[PDB]
Design an enzyme around this catalytic site. Structure first.
Site: not given
Ligand SMILES: Nc1ccn([C@H]2C[C@H](O)[C@@H](COP(=O)(O)NP(=O)(O)OP(=O)(O)O)O2)c(=O)n1
Ligand SMILES: [Mg+2]
Ligand SMILES: [Mg+2]
Ligand SMILES: [Cl-]
Ligand SMILES: [Cl-]
Ligand SMILES: [Cl-]
Ligand code: NA
Length: 326
Positions: A193, A195, A250
């Site tokens: 995604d 963010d 997001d």
């Molecule tokens: N359970 C979670 C999910 C996300 N987060 C935070 C840290 C993540 O890097 C950020 C963004 O969530 P995310 O978009 O689902 N994952 P991230 O962007 O790091 O990698 P992608 O899977 O989107 O490529 O929110 C968190 O602190 N606890």
């Molecule tokens: Mg996200």
């Molecule tokens: Mg992400």
DNA sequence: CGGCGTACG
DNA sequence: CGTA
DNA sequence: GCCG
């Protein structure tokens, strides 16, 4: 090698990719079974290897490394000796793992829902489409858009997408800013995604902003799906050659006073933030979230003007986003 | 043995 | 329950 | 599953 992931640099690419991927399979499977403790250990053990300066070639190099006990060490041992770990392969090809992974990948489906469907005998996406009465509106959107949402978002898609968000944000509240966070801020070239963190330099002006942003995006015809609020989990229409694809986006709003805490939390990684909040509470007696850092004894919040401020208040060496890939 | 991050929609 |  |  410190015990918390927030105490050490973790680059995006490293020297133990195969070993970490195997341990993260077992972590994922542990989560599918509701064993949060074992998931954390396997995630932490995998992250330790990500932080090492060179490849692990012998079992003896695991001695003294945190979070490597009998189980994780046996996994590494078999991979070193045979290039394959029997337990990992057995998980890979199990009907339970494959279906729980398939179902939890759907936007709107978590472990508990996927498990229930699994116990009901459901196994494929078409099994879910045939019985749409048992689906939430969120799950119907995730299932319809599942194919597009399974393709990686490219860093070369992000700038154009940030521009349309900024245009809607600027009309919703002149002076408001959009900051790329999540995986792409850590240097990832792909993502599941995009963010975006939104704020405004005048404290308080951001109140009520996100509804105004979403309404304008929807008026532009750019929102394929979205649900007073401050976080929005959308499905966006992203242009493609002669067409378009659905992408997950997001949006989160924070007052500028909380911006450093929100940027820190939303930049991740997920494991890094869990470890950082665990470190904060257990080692320093402070309570950390994406809104602030709380001293429960003084009953006061720590003011932060930057991420650097937060690392300093926790007594940790600063890590740039690129070194938070725990 | 207890603990495992901490929020919002 | 889902979501970050 | 592992730490403290
Ligand atoms: N359970 C979670 C999910 C996300 N987060 C935070 C840290 C993540 O890097 C950020 C963004 O969530 P995310 O978009 O689902 N994952 P991230 O962007 O790091 O990698 P992608 O899977 O989107 O490529 O929110 C968190 O602190 N606890
Ligand atoms: Mg996200
Ligand atoms: Mg992400
Ligand atoms: Cl467990
Ligand atoms: Cl205060
Ligand atoms: Cl939070
Ligand atoms: Na899901």
């Amino acid at each position: 090698m410190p015990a918390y992931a927030c105490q050490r640099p973790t680059p995006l690419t490293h020297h133990n990719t195969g070993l970490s991927e195997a341990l993260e399979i077992l972590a994922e499977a542990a989560g599918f079974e509701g064993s949060e403790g074992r998931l954390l250990t396997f995630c932490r053990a995998a992250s330790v290897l990500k932080a090492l300066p060179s490849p692990v070639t012998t079992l003896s190099q695991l001695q003294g490394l945190p979070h490597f006990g009998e189980h994780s060490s046996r996994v590494v041992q078999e991979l070193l000796e045979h290039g394959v770990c029997e337990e990992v392969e057995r998980v890979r090809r199990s009907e339970r793992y494959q279906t729980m992974k398939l179902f939890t990948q759907i936007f709107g489906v978590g472990v508990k829902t996927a498990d229930r469907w699994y116990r009901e005998g459901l196994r494929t996406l078409d099994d879910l489409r045939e019985q749409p009465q048992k689906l939430t509106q969120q799950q119907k959107a995730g299932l319809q858009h599942h194919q597009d949402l399974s393709t990686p978002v490219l860093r070369s898609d992000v700038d154009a997408l940030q521009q349309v968000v900024e245009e809607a944000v600027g009309q919703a509240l002149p002076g408001a800013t959009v900051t790329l966070t999540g995986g792409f801020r850590r240097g990832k070239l792909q993502g599941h995604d995009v963010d975006f963190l939104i704020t405004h330099p005048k404290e308080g002006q951001e109140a009520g902003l996100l509804p105004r942003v979403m309404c304008r995006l929807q008026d532009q015809g750019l929102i394929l799906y979205h649900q007073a609020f401050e976080r929005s989990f959308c499905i966006f229409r992203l242009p493609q050659p002669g067409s378009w694809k659905a992408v997950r986006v997001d949006l989160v709003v924070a007052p500028v006073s909380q911006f450093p805490f929100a940027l820190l939390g939303w930049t991740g990684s997920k494991l890094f933030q869990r470890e950082l909040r665990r470190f904060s509470r257990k080692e320093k007696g402070l309570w950390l979230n994406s809104h602030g850092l709380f001293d429960p004894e003084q009953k006061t919040f720590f003011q932060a003007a930057s991420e650097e401020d937060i690392f300093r208040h926790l007594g940790l060496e600063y890590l740039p986003p690129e070194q938070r890939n725990a």
